[PDB]
Short mmCIF file of N, CA, C and O and ligand atoms in Angstrom, two decimals:
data_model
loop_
_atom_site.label_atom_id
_atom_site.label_comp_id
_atom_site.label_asym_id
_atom_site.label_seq_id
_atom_site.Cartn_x
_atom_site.Cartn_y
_atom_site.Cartn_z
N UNK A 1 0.81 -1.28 0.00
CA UNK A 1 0.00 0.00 0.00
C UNK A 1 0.82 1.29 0.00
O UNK A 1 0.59 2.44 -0.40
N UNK A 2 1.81 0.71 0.57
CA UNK A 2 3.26 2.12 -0.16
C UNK A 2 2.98 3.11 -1.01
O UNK A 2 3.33 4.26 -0.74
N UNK A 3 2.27 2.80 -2.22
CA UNK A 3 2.19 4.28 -3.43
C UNK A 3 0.85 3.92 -3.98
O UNK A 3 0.70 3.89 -5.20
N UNK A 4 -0.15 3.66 -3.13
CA UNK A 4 -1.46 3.37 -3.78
C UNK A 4 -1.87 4.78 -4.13
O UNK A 4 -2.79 4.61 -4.93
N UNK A 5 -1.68 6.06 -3.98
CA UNK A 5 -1.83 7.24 -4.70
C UNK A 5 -1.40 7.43 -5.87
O UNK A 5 -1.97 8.17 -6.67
N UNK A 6 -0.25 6.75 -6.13
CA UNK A 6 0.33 7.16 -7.74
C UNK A 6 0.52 5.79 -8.65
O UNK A 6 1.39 5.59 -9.51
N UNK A 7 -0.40 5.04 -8.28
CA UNK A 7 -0.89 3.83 -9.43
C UNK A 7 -1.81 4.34 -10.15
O UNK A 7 -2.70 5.06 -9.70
N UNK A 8 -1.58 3.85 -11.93
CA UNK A 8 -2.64 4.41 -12.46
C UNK A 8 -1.57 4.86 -13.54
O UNK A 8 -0.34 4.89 -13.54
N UNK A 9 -2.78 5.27 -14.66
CA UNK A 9 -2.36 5.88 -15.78
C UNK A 9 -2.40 7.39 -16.09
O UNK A 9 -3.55 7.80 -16.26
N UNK A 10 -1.46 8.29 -16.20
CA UNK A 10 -1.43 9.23 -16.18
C UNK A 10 -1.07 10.34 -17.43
O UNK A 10 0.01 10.04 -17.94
N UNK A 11 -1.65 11.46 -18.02
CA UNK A 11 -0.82 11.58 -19.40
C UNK A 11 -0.71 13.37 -19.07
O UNK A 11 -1.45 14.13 -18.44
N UNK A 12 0.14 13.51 -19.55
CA UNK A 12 1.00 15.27 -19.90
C UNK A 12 0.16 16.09 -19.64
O UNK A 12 -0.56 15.84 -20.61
N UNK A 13 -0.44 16.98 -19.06
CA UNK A 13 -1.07 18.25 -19.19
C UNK A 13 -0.32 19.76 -19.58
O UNK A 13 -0.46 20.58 -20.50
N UNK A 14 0.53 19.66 -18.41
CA UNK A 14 1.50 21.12 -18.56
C UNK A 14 2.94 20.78 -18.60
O UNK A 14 3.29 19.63 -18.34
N UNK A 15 3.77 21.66 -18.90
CA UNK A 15 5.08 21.65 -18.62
C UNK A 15 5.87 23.13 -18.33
O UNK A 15 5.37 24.15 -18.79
N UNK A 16 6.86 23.16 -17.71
CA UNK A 16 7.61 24.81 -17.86
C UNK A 16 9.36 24.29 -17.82
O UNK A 16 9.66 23.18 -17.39
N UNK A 17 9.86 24.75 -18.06
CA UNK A 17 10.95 24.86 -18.49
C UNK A 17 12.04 24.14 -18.53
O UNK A 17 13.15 24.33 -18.01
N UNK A 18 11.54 23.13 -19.32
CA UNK A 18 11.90 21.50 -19.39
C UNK A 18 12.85 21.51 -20.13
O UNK A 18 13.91 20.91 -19.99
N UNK A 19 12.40 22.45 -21.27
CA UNK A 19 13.89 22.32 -22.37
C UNK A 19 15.30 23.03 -21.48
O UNK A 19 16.39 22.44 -21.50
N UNK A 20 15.10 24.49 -20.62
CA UNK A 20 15.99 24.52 -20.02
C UNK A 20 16.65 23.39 -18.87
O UNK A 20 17.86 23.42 -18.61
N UNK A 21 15.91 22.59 -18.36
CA UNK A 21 15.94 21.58 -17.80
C UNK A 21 16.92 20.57 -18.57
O UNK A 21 18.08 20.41 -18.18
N UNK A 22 16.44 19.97 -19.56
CA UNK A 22 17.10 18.94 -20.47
C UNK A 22 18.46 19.72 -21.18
O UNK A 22 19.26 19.03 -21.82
N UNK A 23 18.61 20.69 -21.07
CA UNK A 23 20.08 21.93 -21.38
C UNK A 23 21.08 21.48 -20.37
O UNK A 23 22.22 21.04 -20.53
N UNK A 24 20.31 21.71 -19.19
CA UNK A 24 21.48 21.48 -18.21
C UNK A 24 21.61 20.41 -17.82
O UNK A 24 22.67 20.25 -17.21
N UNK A 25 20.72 19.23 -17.92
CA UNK A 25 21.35 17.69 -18.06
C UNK A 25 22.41 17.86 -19.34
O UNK A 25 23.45 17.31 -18.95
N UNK A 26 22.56 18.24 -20.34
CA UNK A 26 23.40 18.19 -21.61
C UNK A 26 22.72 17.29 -22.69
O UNK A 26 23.30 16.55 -23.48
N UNK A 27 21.50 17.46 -22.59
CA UNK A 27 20.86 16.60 -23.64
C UNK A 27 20.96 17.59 -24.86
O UNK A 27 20.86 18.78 -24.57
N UNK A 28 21.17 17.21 -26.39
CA UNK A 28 21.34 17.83 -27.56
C UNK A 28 20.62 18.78 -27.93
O UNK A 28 19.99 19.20 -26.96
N UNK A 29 20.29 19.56 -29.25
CA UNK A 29 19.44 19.96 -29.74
C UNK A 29 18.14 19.10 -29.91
O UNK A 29 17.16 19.04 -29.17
N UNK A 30 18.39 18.46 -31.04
CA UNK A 30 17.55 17.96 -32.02
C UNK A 30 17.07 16.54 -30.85
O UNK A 30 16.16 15.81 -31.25
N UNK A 31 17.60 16.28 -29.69
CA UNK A 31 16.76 15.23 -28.89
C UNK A 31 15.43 16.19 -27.99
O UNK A 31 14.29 15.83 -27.71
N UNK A 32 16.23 17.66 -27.65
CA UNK A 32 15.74 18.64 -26.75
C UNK A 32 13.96 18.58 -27.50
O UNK A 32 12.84 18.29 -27.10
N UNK A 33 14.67 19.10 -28.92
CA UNK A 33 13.72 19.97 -29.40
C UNK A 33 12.07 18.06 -29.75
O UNK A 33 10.85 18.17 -29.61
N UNK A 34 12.76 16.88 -30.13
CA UNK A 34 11.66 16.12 -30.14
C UNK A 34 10.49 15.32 -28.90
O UNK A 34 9.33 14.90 -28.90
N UNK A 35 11.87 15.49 -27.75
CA UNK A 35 11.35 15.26 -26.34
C UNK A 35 10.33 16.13 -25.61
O UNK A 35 9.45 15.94 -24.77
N UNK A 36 10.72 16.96 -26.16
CA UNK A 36 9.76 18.67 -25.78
C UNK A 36 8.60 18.31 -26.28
O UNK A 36 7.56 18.48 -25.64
N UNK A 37 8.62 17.87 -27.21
CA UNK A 37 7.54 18.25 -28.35
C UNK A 37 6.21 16.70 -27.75
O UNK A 37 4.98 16.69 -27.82
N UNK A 38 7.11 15.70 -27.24
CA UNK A 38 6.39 14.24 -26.50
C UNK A 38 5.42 15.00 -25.23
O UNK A 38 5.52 15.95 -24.45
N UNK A 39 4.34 13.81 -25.62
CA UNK A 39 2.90 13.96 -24.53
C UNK A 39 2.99 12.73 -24.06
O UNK A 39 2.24 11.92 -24.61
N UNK A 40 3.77 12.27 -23.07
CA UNK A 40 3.83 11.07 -22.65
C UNK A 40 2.92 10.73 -21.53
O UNK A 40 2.57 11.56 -20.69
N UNK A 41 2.50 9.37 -21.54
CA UNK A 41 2.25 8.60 -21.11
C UNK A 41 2.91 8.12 -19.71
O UNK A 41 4.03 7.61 -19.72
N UNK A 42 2.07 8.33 -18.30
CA UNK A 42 3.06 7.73 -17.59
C UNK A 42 2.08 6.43 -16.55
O UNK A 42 1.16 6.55 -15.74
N UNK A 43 2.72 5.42 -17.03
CA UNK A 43 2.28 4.20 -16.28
C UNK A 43 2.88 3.89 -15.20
O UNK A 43 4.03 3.43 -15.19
N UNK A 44 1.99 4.16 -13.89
CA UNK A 44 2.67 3.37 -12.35
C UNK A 44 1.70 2.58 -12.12
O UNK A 44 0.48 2.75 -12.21
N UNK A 45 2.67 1.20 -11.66
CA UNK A 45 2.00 0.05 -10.92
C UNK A 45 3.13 -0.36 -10.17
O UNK A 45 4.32 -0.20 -10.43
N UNK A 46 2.48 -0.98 -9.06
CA UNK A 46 2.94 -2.50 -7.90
C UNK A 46 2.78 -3.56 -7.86
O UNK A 46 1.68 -4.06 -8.11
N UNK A 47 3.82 -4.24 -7.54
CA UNK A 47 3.53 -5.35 -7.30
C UNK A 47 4.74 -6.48 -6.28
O UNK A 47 5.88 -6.89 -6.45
N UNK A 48 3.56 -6.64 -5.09
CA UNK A 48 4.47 -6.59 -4.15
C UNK A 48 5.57 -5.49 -3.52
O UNK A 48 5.13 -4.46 -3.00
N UNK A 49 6.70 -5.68 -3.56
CA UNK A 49 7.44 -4.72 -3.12
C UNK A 49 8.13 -3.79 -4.28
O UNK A 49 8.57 -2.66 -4.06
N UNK A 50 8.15 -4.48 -5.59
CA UNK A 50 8.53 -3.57 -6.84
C UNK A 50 7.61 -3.19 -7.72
O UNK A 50 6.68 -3.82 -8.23
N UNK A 51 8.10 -1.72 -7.88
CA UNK A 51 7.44 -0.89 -8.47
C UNK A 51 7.79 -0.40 -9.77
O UNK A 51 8.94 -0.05 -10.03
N UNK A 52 6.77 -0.36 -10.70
CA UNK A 52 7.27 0.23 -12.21
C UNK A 52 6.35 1.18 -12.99
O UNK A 52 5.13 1.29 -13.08
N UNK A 53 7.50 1.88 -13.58
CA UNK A 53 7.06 3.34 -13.96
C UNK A 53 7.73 2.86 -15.55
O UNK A 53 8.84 2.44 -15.90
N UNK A 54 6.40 3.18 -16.31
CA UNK A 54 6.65 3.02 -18.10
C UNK A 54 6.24 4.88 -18.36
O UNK A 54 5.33 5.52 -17.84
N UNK A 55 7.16 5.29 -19.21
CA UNK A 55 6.56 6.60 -20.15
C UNK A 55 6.71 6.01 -21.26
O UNK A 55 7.63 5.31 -21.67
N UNK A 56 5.44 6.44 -21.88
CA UNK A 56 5.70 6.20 -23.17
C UNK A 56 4.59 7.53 -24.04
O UNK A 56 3.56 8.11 -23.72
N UNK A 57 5.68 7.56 -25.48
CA UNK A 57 5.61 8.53 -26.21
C UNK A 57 5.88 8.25 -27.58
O UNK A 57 6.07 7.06 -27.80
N UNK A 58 5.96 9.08 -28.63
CA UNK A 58 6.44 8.92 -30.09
C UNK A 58 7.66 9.30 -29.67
O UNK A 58 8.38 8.43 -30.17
N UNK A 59 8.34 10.01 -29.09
CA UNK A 59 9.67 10.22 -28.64
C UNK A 59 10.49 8.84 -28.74
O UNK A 59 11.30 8.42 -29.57
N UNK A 60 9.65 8.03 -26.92
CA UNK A 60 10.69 7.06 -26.63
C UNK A 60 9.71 6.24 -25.63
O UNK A 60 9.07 7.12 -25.04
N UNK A 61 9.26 4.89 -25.14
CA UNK A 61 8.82 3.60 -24.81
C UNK A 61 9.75 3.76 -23.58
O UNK A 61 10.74 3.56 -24.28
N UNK A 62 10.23 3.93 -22.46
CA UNK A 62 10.97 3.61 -21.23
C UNK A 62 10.09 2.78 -20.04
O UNK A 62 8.89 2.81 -19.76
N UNK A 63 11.39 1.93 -19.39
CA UNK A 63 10.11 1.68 -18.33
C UNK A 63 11.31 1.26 -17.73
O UNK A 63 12.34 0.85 -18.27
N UNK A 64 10.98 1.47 -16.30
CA UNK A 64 12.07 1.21 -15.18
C UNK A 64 11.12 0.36 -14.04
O UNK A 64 9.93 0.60 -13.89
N UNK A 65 11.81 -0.62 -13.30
CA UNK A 65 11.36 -1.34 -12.39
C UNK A 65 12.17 -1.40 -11.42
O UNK A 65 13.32 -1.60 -11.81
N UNK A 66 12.05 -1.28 -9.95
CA UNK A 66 12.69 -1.14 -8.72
C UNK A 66 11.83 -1.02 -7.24
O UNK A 66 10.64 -0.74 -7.10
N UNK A 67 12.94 -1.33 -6.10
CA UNK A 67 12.70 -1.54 -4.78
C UNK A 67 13.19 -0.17 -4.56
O UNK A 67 14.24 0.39 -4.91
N UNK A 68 11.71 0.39 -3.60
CA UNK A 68 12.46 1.49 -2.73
C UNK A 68 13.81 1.33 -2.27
O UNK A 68 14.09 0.32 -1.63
N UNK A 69 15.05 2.56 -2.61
CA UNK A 69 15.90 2.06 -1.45
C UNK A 69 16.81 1.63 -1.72
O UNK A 69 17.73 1.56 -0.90
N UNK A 70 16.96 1.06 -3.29
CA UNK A 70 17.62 -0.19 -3.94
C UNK A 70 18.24 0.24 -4.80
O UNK A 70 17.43 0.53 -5.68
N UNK A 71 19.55 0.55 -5.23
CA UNK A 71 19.82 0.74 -6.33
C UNK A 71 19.99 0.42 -7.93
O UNK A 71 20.57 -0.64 -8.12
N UNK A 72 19.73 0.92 -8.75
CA UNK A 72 19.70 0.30 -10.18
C UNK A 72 20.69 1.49 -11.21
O UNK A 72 21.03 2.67 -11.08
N UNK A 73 20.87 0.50 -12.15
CA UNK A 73 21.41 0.96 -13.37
C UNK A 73 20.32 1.05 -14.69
O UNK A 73 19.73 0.12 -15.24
N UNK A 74 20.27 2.64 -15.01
CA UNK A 74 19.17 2.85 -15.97
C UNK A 74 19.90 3.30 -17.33
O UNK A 74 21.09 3.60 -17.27
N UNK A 75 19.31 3.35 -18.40
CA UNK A 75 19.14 4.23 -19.23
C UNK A 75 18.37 5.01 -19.85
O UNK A 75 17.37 4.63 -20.46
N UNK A 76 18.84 6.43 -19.74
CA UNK A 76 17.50 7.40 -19.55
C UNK A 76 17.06 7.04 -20.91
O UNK A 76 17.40 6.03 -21.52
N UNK A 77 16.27 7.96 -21.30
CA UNK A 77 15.50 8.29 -22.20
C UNK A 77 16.31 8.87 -23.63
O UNK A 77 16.35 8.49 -24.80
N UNK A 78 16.89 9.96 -22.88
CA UNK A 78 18.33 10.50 -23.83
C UNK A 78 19.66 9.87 -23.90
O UNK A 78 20.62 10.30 -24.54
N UNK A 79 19.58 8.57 -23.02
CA UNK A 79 20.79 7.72 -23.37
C UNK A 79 22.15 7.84 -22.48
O UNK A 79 23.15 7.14 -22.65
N UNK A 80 22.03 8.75 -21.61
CA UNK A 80 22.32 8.57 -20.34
C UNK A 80 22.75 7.20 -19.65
O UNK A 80 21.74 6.49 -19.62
N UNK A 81 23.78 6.57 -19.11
CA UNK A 81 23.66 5.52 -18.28
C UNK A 81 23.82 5.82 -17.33
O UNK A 81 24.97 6.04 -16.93
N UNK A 82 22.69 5.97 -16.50
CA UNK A 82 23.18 6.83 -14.62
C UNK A 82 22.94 5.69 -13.83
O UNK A 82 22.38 4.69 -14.28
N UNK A 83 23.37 5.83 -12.60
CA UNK A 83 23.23 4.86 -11.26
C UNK A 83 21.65 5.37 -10.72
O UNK A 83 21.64 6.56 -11.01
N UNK A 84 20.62 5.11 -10.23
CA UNK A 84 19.72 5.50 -9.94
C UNK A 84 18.97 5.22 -8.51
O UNK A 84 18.68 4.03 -8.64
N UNK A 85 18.52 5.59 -7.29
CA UNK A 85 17.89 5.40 -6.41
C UNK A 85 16.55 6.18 -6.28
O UNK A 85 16.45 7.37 -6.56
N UNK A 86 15.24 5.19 -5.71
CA UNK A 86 14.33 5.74 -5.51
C UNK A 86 13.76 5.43 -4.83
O UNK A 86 13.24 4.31 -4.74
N UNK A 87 13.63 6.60 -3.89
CA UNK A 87 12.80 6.45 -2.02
C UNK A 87 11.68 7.39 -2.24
O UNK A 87 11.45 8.08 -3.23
N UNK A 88 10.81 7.24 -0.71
CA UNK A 88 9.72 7.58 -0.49
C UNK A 88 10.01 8.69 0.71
O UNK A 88 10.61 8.45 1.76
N UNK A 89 9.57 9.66 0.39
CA UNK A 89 10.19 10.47 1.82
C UNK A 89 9.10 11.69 2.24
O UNK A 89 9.08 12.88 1.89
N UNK A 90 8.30 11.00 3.04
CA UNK A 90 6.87 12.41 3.41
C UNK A 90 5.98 12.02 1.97
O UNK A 90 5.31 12.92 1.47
N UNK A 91 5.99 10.81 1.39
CA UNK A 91 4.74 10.58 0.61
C UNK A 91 5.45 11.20 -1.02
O UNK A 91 4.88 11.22 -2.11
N UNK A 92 6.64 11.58 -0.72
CA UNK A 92 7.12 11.96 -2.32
C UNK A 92 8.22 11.00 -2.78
O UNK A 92 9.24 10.76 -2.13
N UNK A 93 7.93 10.49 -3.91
CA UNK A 93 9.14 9.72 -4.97
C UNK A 93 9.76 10.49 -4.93
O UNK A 93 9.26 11.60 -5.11
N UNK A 94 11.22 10.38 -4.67
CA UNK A 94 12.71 11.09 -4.50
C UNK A 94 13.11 10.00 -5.51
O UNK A 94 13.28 8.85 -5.11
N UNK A 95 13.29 10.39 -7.13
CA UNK A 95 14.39 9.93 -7.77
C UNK A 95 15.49 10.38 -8.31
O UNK A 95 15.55 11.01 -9.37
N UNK A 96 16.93 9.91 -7.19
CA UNK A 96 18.38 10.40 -8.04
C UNK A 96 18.88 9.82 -9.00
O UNK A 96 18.77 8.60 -9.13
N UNK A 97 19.63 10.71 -9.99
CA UNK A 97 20.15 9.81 -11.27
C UNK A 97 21.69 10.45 -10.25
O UNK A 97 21.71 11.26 -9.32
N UNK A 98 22.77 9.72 -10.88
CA UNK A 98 24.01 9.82 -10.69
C UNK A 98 25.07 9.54 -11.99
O UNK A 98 25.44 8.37 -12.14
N UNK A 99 25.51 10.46 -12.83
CA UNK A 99 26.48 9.90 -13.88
C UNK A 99 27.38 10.91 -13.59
O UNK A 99 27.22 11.79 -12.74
N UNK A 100 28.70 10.69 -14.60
CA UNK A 100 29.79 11.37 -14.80
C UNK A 100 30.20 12.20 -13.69
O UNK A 100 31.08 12.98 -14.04
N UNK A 101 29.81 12.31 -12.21
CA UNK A 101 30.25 13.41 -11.45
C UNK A 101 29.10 14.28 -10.92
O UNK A 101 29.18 15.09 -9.99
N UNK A 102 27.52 13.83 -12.00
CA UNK A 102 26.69 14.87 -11.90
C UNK A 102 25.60 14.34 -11.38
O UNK A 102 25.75 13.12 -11.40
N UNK A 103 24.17 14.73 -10.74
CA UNK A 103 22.94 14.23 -10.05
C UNK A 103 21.75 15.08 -10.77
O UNK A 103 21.88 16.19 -11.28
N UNK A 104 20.81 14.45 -10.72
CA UNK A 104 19.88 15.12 -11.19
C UNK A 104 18.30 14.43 -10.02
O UNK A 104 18.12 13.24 -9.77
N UNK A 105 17.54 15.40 -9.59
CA UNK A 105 16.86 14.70 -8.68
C UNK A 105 15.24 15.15 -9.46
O UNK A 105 14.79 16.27 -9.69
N UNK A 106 14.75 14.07 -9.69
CA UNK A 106 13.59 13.73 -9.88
C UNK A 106 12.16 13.88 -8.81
O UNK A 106 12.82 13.25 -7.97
N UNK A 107 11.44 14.02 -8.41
CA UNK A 107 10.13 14.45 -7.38
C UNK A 107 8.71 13.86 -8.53
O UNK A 107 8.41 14.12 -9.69
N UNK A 108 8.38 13.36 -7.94
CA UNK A 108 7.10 13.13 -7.98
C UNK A 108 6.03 12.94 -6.58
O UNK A 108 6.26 12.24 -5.60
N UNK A 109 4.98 13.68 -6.82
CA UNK A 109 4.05 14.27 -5.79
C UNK A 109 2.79 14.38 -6.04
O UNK A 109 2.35 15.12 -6.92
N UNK A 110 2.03 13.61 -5.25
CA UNK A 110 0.64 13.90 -5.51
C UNK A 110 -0.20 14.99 -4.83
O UNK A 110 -0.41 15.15 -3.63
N UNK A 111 -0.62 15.68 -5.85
CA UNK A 111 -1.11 16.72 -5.26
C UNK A 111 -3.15 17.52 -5.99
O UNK A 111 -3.65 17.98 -7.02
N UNK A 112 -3.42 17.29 -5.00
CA UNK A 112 -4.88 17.16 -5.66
C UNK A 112 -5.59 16.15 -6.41
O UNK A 112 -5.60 14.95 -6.15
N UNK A 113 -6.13 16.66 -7.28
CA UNK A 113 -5.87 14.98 -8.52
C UNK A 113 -4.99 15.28 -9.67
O UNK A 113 -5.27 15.06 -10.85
N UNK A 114 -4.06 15.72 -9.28
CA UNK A 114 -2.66 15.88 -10.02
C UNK A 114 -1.48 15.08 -9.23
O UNK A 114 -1.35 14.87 -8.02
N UNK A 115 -0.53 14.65 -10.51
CA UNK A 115 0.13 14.15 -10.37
C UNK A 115 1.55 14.76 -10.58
O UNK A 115 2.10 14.33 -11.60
N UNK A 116 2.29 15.69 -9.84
CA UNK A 116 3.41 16.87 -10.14
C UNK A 116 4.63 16.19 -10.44
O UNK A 116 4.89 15.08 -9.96
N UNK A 117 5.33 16.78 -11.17
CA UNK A 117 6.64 16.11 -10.84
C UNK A 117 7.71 17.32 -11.58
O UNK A 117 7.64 18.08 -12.55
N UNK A 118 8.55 17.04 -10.69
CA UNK A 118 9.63 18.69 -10.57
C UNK A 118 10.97 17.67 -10.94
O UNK A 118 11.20 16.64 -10.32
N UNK A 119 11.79 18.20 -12.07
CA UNK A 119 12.75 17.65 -12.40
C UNK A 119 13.98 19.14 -11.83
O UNK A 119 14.01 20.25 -12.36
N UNK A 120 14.55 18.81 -11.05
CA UNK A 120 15.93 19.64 -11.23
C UNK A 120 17.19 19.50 -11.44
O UNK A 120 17.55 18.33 -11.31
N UNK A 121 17.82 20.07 -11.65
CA UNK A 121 19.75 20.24 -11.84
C UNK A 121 19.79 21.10 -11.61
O UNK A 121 18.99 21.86 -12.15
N UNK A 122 20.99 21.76 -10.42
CA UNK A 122 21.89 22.80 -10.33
C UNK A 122 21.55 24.24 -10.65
O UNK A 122 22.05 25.23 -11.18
N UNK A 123 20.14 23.75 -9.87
CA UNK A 123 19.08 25.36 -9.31
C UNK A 123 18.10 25.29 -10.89
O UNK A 123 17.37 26.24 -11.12
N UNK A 124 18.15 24.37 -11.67
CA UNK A 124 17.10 24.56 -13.00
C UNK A 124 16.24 23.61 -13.06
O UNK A 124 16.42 22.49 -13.53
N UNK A 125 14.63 24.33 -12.25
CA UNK A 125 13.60 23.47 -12.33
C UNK A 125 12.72 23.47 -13.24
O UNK A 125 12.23 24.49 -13.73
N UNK A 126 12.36 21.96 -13.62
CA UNK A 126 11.44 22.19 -14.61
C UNK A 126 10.03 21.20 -14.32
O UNK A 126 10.09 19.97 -14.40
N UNK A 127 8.83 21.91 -13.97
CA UNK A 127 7.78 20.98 -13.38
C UNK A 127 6.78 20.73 -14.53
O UNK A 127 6.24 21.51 -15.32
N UNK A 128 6.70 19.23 -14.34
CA UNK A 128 5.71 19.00 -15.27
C UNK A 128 4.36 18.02 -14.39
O UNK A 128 4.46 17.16 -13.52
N UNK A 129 3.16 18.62 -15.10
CA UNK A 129 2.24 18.20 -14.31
C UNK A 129 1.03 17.14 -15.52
O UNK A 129 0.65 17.33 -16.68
N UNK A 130 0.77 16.08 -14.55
CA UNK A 130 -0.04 15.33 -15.53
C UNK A 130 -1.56 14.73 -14.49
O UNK A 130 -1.57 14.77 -13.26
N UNK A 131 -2.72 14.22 -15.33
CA UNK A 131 -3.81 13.87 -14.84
C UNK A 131 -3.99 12.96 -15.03
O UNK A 131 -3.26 12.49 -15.90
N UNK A 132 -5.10 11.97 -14.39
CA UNK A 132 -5.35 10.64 -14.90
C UNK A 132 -6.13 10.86 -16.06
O UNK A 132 -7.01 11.66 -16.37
N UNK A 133 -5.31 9.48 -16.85
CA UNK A 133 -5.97 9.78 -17.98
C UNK A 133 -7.20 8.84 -18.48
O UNK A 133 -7.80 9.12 -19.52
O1 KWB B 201 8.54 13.57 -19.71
C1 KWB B 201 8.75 13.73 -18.44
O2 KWB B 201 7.83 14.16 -17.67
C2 KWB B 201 10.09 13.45 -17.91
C3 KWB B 201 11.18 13.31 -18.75
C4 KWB B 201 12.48 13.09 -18.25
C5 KWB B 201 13.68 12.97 -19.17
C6 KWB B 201 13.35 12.83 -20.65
C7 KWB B 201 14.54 12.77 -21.54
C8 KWB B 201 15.47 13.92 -21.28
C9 KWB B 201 15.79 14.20 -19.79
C10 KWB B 201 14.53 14.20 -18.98
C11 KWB B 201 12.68 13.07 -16.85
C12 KWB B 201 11.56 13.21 -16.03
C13 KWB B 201 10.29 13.42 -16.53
O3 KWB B 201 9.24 13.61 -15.66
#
């Protein structure tokens, strides 16, 4: 019963300043400018103690599976291979990526019947908010 708030299917409503966001991860132009442009899809489910989160888009199909707590090896979306952890802390998904020296922390939060989620790097937030869909 861990994340029975954020099971469910969820899709894109808003975004703000994601492309500056995906700048300061060092993601490219021409990935910036098609990722931007994606209305993804975000699938959470449980089962048992692991949990999995699919986006999917014309962009890019991702899906990650993990134990609170636990560490994994992902590859983002933009091709990234980061170290990754994801805890629960006051009811919010805390996900860190870790590559080359650098972190990027992920938030997801339920809030109303919204589903928030605040991507930052190195003071550049970019929140994107989605509904059930
Ligand atoms: O679409 C999203 O909402 C979303 C996308 C990402 C990555 C996509 C590829 C480039 C780096 C960010 C990270 C968190 C998100 O919440």
């Amino acid at each position: 019963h861990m994340c029975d708030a954020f099971v469910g299917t969820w899709k894109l409503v808003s975004s703000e300043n994601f492309d500056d966001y995906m700048k300061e991860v060092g993601v490219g132009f021409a990935t910036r400018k098609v990722a931007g442009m994606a209305k993804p899809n975000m699938i959470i489910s449980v089962n048992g103690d692991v949990i999995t989160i699919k986006s999917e888009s014309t962009f890019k199909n991702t899906e990650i599976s993990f134990i609170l707590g636990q560490e994994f090896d992902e590859v983002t979306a933009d091709d990234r291979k980061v170290k990754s952890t994801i805890t629960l802390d006051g009811g919010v998904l805390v996900h860190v990526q870790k590559w080359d020296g650098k972190s990027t922390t992920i938030k997801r939060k339920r809030e109303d019947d919204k589903l928030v989620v605040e991507c930052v790097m190195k003071g550049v937030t970019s929140t994107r908010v989605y509904e059930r869909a």
